[PDB]
Amino acid sequence: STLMKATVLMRQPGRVQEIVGALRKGGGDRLQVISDFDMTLSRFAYNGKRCPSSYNILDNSKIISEECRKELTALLHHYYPIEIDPHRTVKEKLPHMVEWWTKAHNLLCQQKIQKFQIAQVVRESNAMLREGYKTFFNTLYHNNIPLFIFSAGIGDILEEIIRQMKVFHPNIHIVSNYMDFNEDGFLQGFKGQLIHTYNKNSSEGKTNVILLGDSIGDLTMADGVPGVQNILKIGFLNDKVEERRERYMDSYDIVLEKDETLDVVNGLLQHILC
Numbered sequence: 001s002t003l004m005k006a007t008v009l010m011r012q013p014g015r016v017q018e019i020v021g022a023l024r025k026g027g028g029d030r031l032q033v034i035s036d037f038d039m040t041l042s043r044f045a046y047n048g049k050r051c052p053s054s055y056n057i058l059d060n061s062k063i064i065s066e067e068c069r070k071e072l073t074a075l076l077h078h079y080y081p082i083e084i085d086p087h088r089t090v091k092e093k094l095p096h097m098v099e100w101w102t103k104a105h106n107l108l109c110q111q112k113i114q115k116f117q118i119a120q121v122v123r124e125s126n127a128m129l130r131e132g133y134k135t136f137f138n139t140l141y142h143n144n145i146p147l148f149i150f151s152a153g154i155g156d157i158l159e160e161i162i163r164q165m166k167v168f169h170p171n172i173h174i175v176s177n178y179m180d181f182n183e184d185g186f187l188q189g190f191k192g193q194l195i196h197t198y199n200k201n202s203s204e205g206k207t208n209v210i211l212l213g214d215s216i217g218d219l220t221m222a223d224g225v226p227g228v229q230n231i232l233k234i235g236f237l238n239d240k241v242e243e244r245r246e247r248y249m250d251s252y253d254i255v256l257e258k259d260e261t262l263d264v265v266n267g268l269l270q271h272i273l274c
């Protein structure tokens with residue numbers, strides 16, 4: 001019944017039925033959720049307007065100068081055509097993506113950004129999560145299901161969004177780029193491994209996976225999780241739907257077309273965990 005919502009597309013509904021059945025048989029003990037952030041857990045559009053990405057939330061804020069905003073936009077102008085070019089292989093795109101993210105991160109480090117300002121920028125932003133986010137985050141937490149959120153954005157921004165929406169629970173594990181601040185609270189670098197849009201993947205018995213994404217690249221987020229026995233991939237198809245629908249349906253198990261809610265995922269979780 002969950003899958004009878006009007007936004008639901010399935011190329012092989014019988015296969016979806018078998019995967020959901022295996023997930024239910026395995027129970028929450030075997031389940032983990034692997035999800036993209038922007039335009040998957042965050043809402044795509046509201047009240048006739050696009051909702052901001054994590055990148056937009058910081059870049060359009062009061063703590064980024066207009067000159068820095070122009071330089072970030074110039075980097076985007078150069079690298080976006082490379083990023084989306086289907087005739088460049090993922091391997092050929094990698095060094096360009098590393099360059100772009102390294103350059104953007106360094107520009108942010110050359111501003112005067114203070115830790116306390118991150119909460120402020122998010123609070124003043126138009127950040128929005130999909131409808132049903134409380135049920136989604138609470139169901140996972142109450143059922144002890146780890147949620148891995150991958151984002152090539154800024155971890156601090158993601159965390160403040162989820163915290164300010166009152167759903168940042170200890171079962172959430174964000175894999176993203178976290179800021180490093182000096183003793184005076186000023187941004188000085190980024191922590192750990194660089195995550196760009198083409199290395200959002202894993203690079204305990206939780207062998208069943210629900211993957212949530214909104215781009216064709218998100219299909220790989222669970223690659224490299226060892227010993228996965230069952231995976232159900234759910235893809236939000238937010239825009240350019242006539243152009244994208246076939247490729248989405250042919251790779252994602254379930255596609256949700258212009259669905260600004262987590263209702264289908266929530267219903268699947270309730271079915272699997274009850």
Ligand SMILES: Nc1nc(O)c2c(n1)[nH]c[n+]2Cc1ccc(F)c(F)c1
Nearest residue numbers: 055058059072076100101104105153
């Ligand atoms: N705040 C911020 N601003 C940027 O421009 C950043 C960033 N963080 N990290 C990496 N880039 C470059 C980039 C990569 C993908 C995008 F979709 C995009 F809009 C911008």
Ligand SMILES: [Mg+2]
Nearest residue numbers: 036038039214
């Ligand atoms: Mg996304």
